[PDB]
Amino acid sequence: TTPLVHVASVEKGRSYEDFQKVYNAIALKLREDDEYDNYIGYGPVLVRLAWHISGTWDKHDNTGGSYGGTYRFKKEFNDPSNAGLQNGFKFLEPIHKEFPWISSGDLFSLGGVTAVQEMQGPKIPWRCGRVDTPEDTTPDNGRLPDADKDAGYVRTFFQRLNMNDREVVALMGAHALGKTHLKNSGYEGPYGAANNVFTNEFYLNLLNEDWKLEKNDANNEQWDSKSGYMMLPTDYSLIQDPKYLSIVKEYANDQDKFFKDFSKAFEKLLENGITFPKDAPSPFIFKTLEEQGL
């Protein structure tokens, strides 16, 4: 068999500040075009893009993962569940031609950490060494979770990503960002009041706001709030399960542990499928534009 072993090979001669200039470039354009998606920005879509490439990973055969950076291909670009992420791709490409040395896998995975931190989120350690790979490394279609299911499907699916209850709930906190659109997913409405700001709001409006199951214009069934908030049945299934409920209520009154656990889980998510050597440098903590005086 010889299970797939993806070794982390650092780019030629590149180091911390070399990737920091990529961070700053992404963080700049993130601040440049703020008129994308009704003044939400490219923040959320860059996070979702980072999770979609890391969600194709299968722990059994070590297939897929963010290591590949195979998003440049045709087969995985036109996926029905991947729609809306073309914008995030065309966001990073003009940045990909000014640093031709950097690989796509590192660029996409650097976009998501960059997005979170610039959106006033937690510091997320990032590692390099994801090298581009031929067209036979591309994962098939349908490895991403379905929007219409229950908590049993959630816990089962994330086992393939090697995630426990705490990590699942924490990673699901990223759904306090942005919104949903019918033109790709088939669901409508903002997740929370603050779209581009990273907060524990996801857990707060879940345990407070009144949620009623209704029908959208796509005939799909979603949960709506009197305040205008929305949630997917699988996001809502977190309070339909006892194990997931205690963690949600923990992240509600405590924001710092959520920031702490998300940074752990999200980093673990992006590094899945990568075998790091013993001489590989310690994880990078990049400086935000606010810390640089901008």
Binding site: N38, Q120, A193
Partner: protein, 103 residues
Amino acid sequence: GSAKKGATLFKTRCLQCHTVEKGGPHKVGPNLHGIFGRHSGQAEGYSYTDANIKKNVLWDENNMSEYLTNPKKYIPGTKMAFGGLKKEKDRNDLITYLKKACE
């Protein structure tokens, strides 16, 4: 500058939280009717933080721009979740759109 483009800015960036025109909504942020800088907060009984009342600040359009630029750096410990308005022109578009509805 342009108060009509501040209408669009307020709709997407604010309206989901605040409201200028009525006095009863109190969604996430408090009502913005009549803000020339009363002082820190206005009371329907809207639960405030401990940060706002501290160091009373008149909301004059020059310091308002600072608060809209970086809400966290201007008032540390604020409950308001807003990234900020980094551009200068869009500020001068939104801040004018306010006080005519504050009549």
